Design a protein around this ligand. Structure first.
Ligand code: MN
Ligand code: MN
Lengths: 178, 177
């Protein structure tokens, strides 16, 4: 049916519109910079362990922030991308629009017990977020982000062996910033 | 070095280089195009393994830096290596407000050079055969369709699966005129 690049493009154009008013933290660069790196991580992960429903899981990597940070409705995602993608973005949303924000334990438990592909997108998200910390973070903020990353590894590393290995290496590398 | 670490180095370099640039006539950042080209390139590897995949993915990210940005060949050579620099050069039909190379010259040099650079151009044209912007007249759509046929003929040797994909995109694009 649908080429992997056509799945990407549909999600990518959607996300570029949805996130058009959003930048990276402390940087004037488009938020799209983050989503590019998450999606690339996910497609690279397939090379080191094939992913069931790779097209839709790539789309979930592109769209994973739409319900939290944009004017995007769950109904829009379900109509345009299907249930599995909608439920992927919901699983990855700590908070949907101005609804209640879920605790990390609740968030990680639901991802651990749910479809492994959703958990795998979270590993790709944290790997992306273990680039060098923003220049305005103190030693304490860095240290806390490092410890939170270790919980994400412990709770979700089951999802994909190679990507868990890569997240551990990023966690070990990030130790140098504090 | 991990394929995604190669992507990130080139991606962050490109986001900075292209920071004031939109898609022509859109508020959307130029980065939108680069994401689709790099994704087409990494997808292509699944259907026929590419030699020097990491550097080829960086070439797909960086392919417009010498045309459109303050980027120098020296910077590309120093940060990404001679293979990436030479790839970006092969794909630059012009450098800034300089004279364009003729299509014949451009495609000939891509056909006779490393097959990876030709493969990135097929991924570039695949990306540019999405529905044409509202502002393109019938003539402009028609001519872009026929230029696409020349790219497939001259460069389709580079990667069989990607050539089959460009052919399908060309046959789909015919509906717009
Ligand atoms: Mn994210
Ligand atoms: Mn291009």
């Amino acid at each position: 049916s649908t080429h992997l690049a056509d799945h990407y493009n549909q999600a990518w154009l959607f996300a570029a519109r949805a996130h058009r008013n959003q930048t990276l933290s402390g940087s004037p660069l488009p938020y799209l910079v983050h989503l590019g790196m998450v999606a690339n991580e996910l497609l690279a992960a397939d090379r080191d362990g094939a992913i069931e429903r790779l097209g839709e899981t790539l789309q979930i990597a592109v769209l994973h922030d739409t319900l939290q940070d944009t004017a995007t409705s769950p109904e829009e995602l379900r109509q345009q991308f299907g249930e599995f993608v909608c439920a992927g973005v919901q699983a990855l949303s700590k908070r949907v629009g101005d609804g209640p924000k879920r605790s990390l334990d609740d968030y990680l438990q639901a991802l651990a017990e749910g479809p492994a592909q959703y958990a795998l997108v979270k590993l790709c998200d944290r790997i992306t977020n273990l680039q060098p910390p923003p220049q305005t973070w103190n030693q304490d903020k860095i240290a806390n982000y490092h410890q939170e990353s270790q919980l994400i590894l412990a709770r979700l590393g089951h999802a994909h062996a190679a990507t868990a290995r890569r997240l551990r290496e990023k966690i070990e590398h990030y130790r140098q910033y504090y």
